[PDB]
């Protein structure tokens, strides 16, 4: 029941990268797995071994792209699962996945009127935080799958080791998938588009957003009449992006880039730090310090201007923009009071970060019915008030980070289809928070659409 | 106060096209000068060893985006100057009338969905037919500048043979010009379209248009953040056209192609017959058979349905698409009634003609103040009959024949600036008929814009 | 305690079974017999096939489709195909390194084919499920079962290592896939430009030590490139590298499980890779591997060797190519240099008269190996060239398609073949001979290779 | 009664003058002596440039811009000037075929330097406006005075034809703006294609006598065009052709009245053409020529013969270059291919020291004329290959650019130019001299120079 991998039995690291990364790792670090140290060394001998997720002239161009959304010249779309399973890591899911960030992509393109960066929670989203080690039902918490497993028994919620291999086969197997997709004819826009299209028609709310998306569809057939081809267009990127959370994952996929050379992270793309990791002398935030790709910072509530000023300015210490990006998730009744002297104090500095609004994890209660859920409602808000923050202010709302699947799941409250208490319990399936489904992603992009527009 | 020319003191054509040329010729033709044969031979010599206006090349070209016309899958606009003048045959003059083209262009393309082919009433529309050869003053009638002169005195509206060489001069200037600002930056359509939004801006009734005005500047945006540059469309191509009416000018402008040998008229790229000259067997119409040119017949209307039919199998015996146009001008009142049966008898013959509308030369009358002129909303009225027309029958309307200028002239009534006949003694600068200004144009292609909508 | 992992297959719930009419089709086709098939236990080969009929694929059927397209470019006499990669992969040297060293010299060997040619070559590499080899011997030197390839045993003489372990059908997915992953950011980074790959080119002509004899073309092929760009071509304005995957479909187990349905016509895709071909041992004209080529829509191929006869020849066409596709089948000829002169004309020209246009492409490598007196196996450069040089004379005297080539090279600096410019010596071949299988062509040879049929392409 | 119609120049009302500024600038800069002018009457001079003042213009500010542009890249060692056509055009021979033959002798010639310098080449015609020449003597061979061009009086050896008609001036725009519009749309027709145009260079070499000469170079532009074709480069996807308009800028009657206002900085453009030059016998530093080419925008060009010092030639660069503009200013040797060699490096040495960036361009026709002994004035391709040879001698020893060449071609098969492939001989001379002035290289010359400058780029 076991494939069984060898242990390798090469390049040193310039001395300077030993010791900040020996010292960054040196330092605590919350929310870890507690596996044995030898086991975990070993997982870690064979993950430097394996062909990289990504490449580091993959991160320098999307770099290149977050750069021009600090600027105001690009908007951020990032979003996918909250959290991948080894279960569902198959064709079916992984292409409804990416269909729909494309769908929502070109409704936000078109209501920016400028490129949209496609960043997915994708190929390595299966570590969690916890704030109680032991659940509701009295198990030691479900901590993502490349921890211990979802399954309701004491086994299966032991830390092992192995599902460190297992999480890079199952990320690797699915950006092989993402990379074939992109630039398969799920890239086009008028395929991509028409599916918005049967959306519109079956969607009860459906009325509301025909207008748009018939001036989308007109705007595409004038491109093609002034004799644009699908032939010659920016081909689709999808980037690949988790929290960085379990640092024996994440510095095993270390690589030294081949114009000094500088440490990439080539578990994915971009990755960020979340709310219980951000510790400002943790190891995570000194982790994130020494690699290259750029990186993101979960800002909840307590958050104060002068706290995310430091994180600024331990992150982005060469003021090199779109290298940090600042992730509001202040809950929708907040986000307004809250979210502006950050803003103004950050902007003081010099430094050119992108704000990108997380409406979902300021969000979330337990419905009546036992299952943890957020309303469509909120979400939307919260994303409503993030861009009468920067307007206010004349910067630059840059993005949005959402939890999504291309399923049909009941998770969610409201959107157009008015998904109930009632209705969560027949189409739940997220281990973990609840993700908008198809419809309500793509509903929620007309919306951000019109926001952008206003 | 005369240039003087040499005369030339010599391809043999193919025997077969000597002897179609000449019956075409020998065929009595109307509407033309009354000069010295002599005199016209020594002129047509000039001409005959002059560069060309056109080359065949370019002529196929359009012939091929003419076919796609006729097919429904691009449409035809065809405006300028209803005469051109010698005297404002200039760069702004010039440059006004290609700037409207492109501009009305932009905004047909977007309401079409569809590529739109621009064919210019230029570089040679100098000659005109006139019912009465004594004009409302007594005198003999202006016949436009390649015959002789607008001036009202005695002398000046001799006919004269040098006007031919004149007419050259001046369409070839004009036609360097119409080349060299198509592939400048008045080609980018960014350019184009801020034009029209200032359009829009201050017009009367600008409101109305104005959400048309931002669909279409959200739509270029979307273009460029697609990641189309202007560097890689397709650059404006601006056709030149004329009425075939003065035969010793088209037939010196005759030139034998180098895949058998036929003739163009490289005069143009493009010429129409008019009302007056469509005798089926007279020599406007046999000259048309014998030239390669895509070509136009005016039909007015005492058009019958079977005469259609007969125009087609003469001048597009081999079943081209696109090789004819049939230019239908019948009166706002009338265009409902008359059009139909033209339209039917034609399609059922198999071959596929353009479709287009003229809705200037039948809705013209003369004002209270003596000024003959046309009113706007009967020109409208009559595209809009036209677009009826074809909608009920399935069939494609084709494109559009104004005139117009770039100049804010005062010859035709109403529009958004609601001119009077009042107003029409102040800025009335056409040797002819009454033309569109360039607001006048605008409103139309928006209007039309709206027909190619709904 | 032996330095070793197990990484659990934990069971997921299965997607839909494949439609009821084409599993029919399939079981029918695999009650074929089998040839060199692992024995390991078939309850534990369903669970492992169970596993990989849901994972992810290698491939997805719009880049086969894509494929098809330029291989019956190939077979009309439009492009060349080059097929290369390692003879076996391993799953200890399926690295980074190594992964982009074989991209960058079939790249390298690409740019000077492509201006040898004056037309598009086709890349598929052997790469991403190349894991799986017969043998000829159940015993080996050493008494022990013969490895088989890290698909189905383990390289190291020991028992334990050499039982067939179906585990290893996983293992070599999830090998297949990480390499793929690594294929596909590869190619559209900068190691896809023209002038990036050309100025290795340069360095390799330098310090050749017969550079002398390619610096004409190399500085021919430099000049190009440069007028490329002096009319306005931007390297991001070309078609941008595509390199697709292939292996030798040998165990049924793995590639059955990784069929696939197309979207929609609808049918059976291997997505295990782009194109897989069938070996000289496994391609008994009634058997289960000939079958199963039948049955999948990928573009396929059969190594055609010195005991071919032109009427077996015509009944693969028959089989495999019963729709009349261009370039759905190619043949791929191992004679030997001494005979292809002789043995492959009778193929050719029975192959045309069926009218059908398959891909005639030279594996000068299988039919010219030999063993030194110091023990290794191996080959030898000037018979290899001398074969590819005899499959030119055989198709321009035909006036036929010399379709491609097909190769076993490294990018690593190894000392498997003897010969090539660097003059590799038997005494030699003890310093770096590193494949688990065949003696491959080294960087320098697989590049001097593609030098000398650049100008067999030019005459 | 003698075979000529007169064509009315109606006068037609004025559209705005130039703004006041500029037109006292202008008037300042008109008041210095101008050499080699016609002598008509003011008044009628008059007449005829407020005819030309409203006329629509040869050329619009955008595209001398563009050039300007192109012309800064040719000055900074980035690509290749190559500048031709006529010595004189003439009205009568101002036809579709003689405009479309020398259209492509430059589009042939363009190619194969592009090739050998791996580099872009800035194409510019002598066309559109080349209609007027100097004169050393007022009274030729026949006693007549002299033929000016056709812009001032006739080549007929005549009295009648012989006298300034200032009426030229018109039939001269109407001649320039026919021309450029054929010239405009040649280049956007299939003349422009690379591959039409290059095998007109391949039946070249095949029928030319020293074709085995240049077959080798004639195989590899082939072979580098069908690489660009295989690497996917669609033709439509290319810099589509632009060859600019250029004459001597001689008549200031016709310069100044050809004055335009760019739309907006806003500034003086001559759009009589894109590029104008001074000549040797009008280049006196304080007179009307000089001071006109600094009152105007365009890229202008100064003809620099064997008197030139080094402190001249650095007083054109600081009078026509006074912005350091790279490219605005080209200097154009002339020296004869027995004296570049030793008088042009003290003139590059002393210009390069100024810091400017001038165009280095090479006449080799000017400096290279003699007369034969069977009467006509003549010119030998090796005298104008050597002196192209020397001045790239000069540059390579200076590490400077040796920017481009200047040559006098027509596309007809004339005899005029001695020597080439062809082996002219004065004999010969007598059955197709056409020039109305110096002799050209034909079309098969031309295209020879090209290969052999190709040659000297490759070195
Ligand atoms: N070198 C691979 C290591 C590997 C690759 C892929 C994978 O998913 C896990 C482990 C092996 O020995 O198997
Ligand atoms: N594997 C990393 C550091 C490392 C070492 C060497 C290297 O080339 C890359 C990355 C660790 O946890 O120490
Ligand atoms: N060959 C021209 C003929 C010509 C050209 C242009 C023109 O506008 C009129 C006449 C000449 O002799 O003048
Ligand atoms: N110039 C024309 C006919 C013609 C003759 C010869 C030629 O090459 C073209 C056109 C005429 O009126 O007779
Ligand atoms: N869902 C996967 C199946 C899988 C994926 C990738 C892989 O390399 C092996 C197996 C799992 O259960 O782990
Ligand atoms: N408006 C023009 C001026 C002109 C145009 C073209 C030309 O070749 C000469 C003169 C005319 O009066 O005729
Ligand atoms: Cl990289
Ligand atoms: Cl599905
Ligand atoms: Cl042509
Ligand atoms: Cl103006
Ligand atoms: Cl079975
Ligand atoms: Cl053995
Ligand atoms: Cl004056
Ligand atoms: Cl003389
Ligand atoms: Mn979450
Ligand atoms: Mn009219
Ligand atoms: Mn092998
Ligand atoms: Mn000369």
């Not at 192995?162 to 890239?187: E, F, H, I, K």
């Not at 928070?433 to 992009?445: K, W």
Request: with cysteine; glycine share 6%; charged share 20%.
């Amino acid at each position: 029941m076991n494939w069984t991998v060898d242990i390798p039995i090469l390049p040193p690291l310039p001395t300077d990268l030993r010791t900040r990364l020996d010292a960054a790792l040196a330092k605590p670090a919350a929310q870890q797995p507690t596996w044995p140290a030898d086991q975990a060394l070993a997982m870690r001998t064979v993950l430097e071994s394996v062909p990289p997720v990504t490449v580091p002239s993959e991160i320098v161009r999307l770099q290149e792209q977050l750069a021009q959304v600090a600027k105001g010249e690009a908007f951020l779309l990032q979003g996918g699962d909250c959290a991948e399973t080894f279960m569902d890591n198959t064709e079916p899911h992984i292409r409804g996945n990416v269909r729909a960030l494309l769908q929502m992509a070109v409704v936000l393109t078109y209501g920016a009127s400028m490129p949209v960066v496609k960043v997915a929670r994708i190929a390595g989203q299966y570590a969690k935080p916890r704030s109680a080690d032991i659940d509701a039902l009295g198990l030691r918490s479900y901590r993502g799958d490349m921890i211990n497993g979802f399954a309701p028994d004491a086994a299966a919620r032991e830390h092992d080791p192995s599902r460190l291999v297992r999480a890079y086969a199952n990320a690797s197997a699915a950006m092989n998938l993402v990379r074939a997709l992109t630039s398969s004819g799920l890239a086009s826009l008028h395929l991509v588009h028409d599916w918005n299209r049967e959306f519109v028609r079956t969607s009860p709310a459906g009325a509301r957003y025909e207008a748009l998306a018939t001036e989308i569809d007109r705007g595409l057939r004038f491109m093609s009449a002034c004799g644009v081809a699908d032939r010659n267009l920016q081909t689709a990127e999808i980037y690949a992006s988790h929290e960085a959370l379990v640092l024996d994952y994440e510095r095993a996929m270390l690589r030294l880039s081949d114009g000094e050379p500088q440490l990439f992270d080539l578990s994915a793309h971009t990755v960020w730090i979340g709310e219980r990791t951000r510790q400002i002398d943790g190891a995570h935030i000194a982790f994130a310090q020494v690699i290259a790709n750029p990186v993101g910072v979960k800002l909840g509530p307590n958050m104060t201007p002068e706290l995310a000023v430091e994180y600024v300015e331990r992150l982005d210490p060469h003021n090199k923009p779109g290298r940090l990006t600042l992730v509001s998730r202040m809950g929708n009744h907040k986000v307004r009071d809250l979210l502006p002297p950050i803003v103004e104090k950050v902007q003081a500095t010099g430094h050119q970060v992108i704000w990108q609004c997380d409406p979902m994890h300021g969000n979330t209660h337990e419905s009546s019915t036992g299952f943890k859920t957020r309303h469509f409602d909120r979400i939307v808000d919260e994303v409503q008030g993030f861009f009468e923050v920067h307007r206010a202010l004349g910067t630059h709302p840059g993005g949005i980070h959402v939890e999504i699947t291309g399923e049909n799941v009941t998770e969610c409250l409201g959107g157009a289809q008015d998904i109930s208490e009632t209705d969560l319990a027949g189409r739940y399936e997220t281990a973990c928070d609840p993700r908008l489904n198809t419809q309500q992603s793509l509903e929620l992009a007309f919306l951000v659409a019109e926001m952008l527009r206003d």
